[PDB]
């Protein structure tokens, strides 16, 4: 029934690449992680850092989450990420995505495992 911790890894963890390969990276990865199976998830981020380093963020800078909760943490350091955003013309089931490689601080909500 997949834990929320596990769902985070499936959706955002890409530790076997240091950056977005090509233009087709989002295209591939949204499919691969099963994120295009019923609907086209419109926006998603993949972090290219080890799991340990992302897990460590939970012990970094505490900040409010967008929803007003206070269980959000900002990485002290910038991490390698790829933003995936469904294109304007995309439609289920041929999901299309623009891929943007960037270096930025990530902000994640944390909970106990």
């Amino acid at each position: 029934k997949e834990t929320a911790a596990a769902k985070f890894e499936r959706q955002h963890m890409d530790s076997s690449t240091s950056a977005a390969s090509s233009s087709n990276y989002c295209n591939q990865m949204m499919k691969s992680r099963n994120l295009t199976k019923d609907r086209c998830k419109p926006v998603n981020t993949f972090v290219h850092e080890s799991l340990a380093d992302v897990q460590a963020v939970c012990s970094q800078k505490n900040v409010a989450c967008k929803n007003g909760q206070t269980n959000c943490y900002q990485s002290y350091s910038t991490m390698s990420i790829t933003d995936c955003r469904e294109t304007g013309s995309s439609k289920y089931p041929n999901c299309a995505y623009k891929t943007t490689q960037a270096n930025k601080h990530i902000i994640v909500a944390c909970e106990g495992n």
């Binding site: 929320a4 959706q11 939970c58 933003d83 960037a102 601080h105 990530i106 909500a109 944390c110």
Partner: peptide, 11 residues
């Protein structure tokens, strides 16, 4: 002990 469960955003 404490793990990420939602991605809030970048920078």
């Amino acid at each position: 002990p404490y793990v990420p469960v939602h991605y809030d955003a970048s920078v």
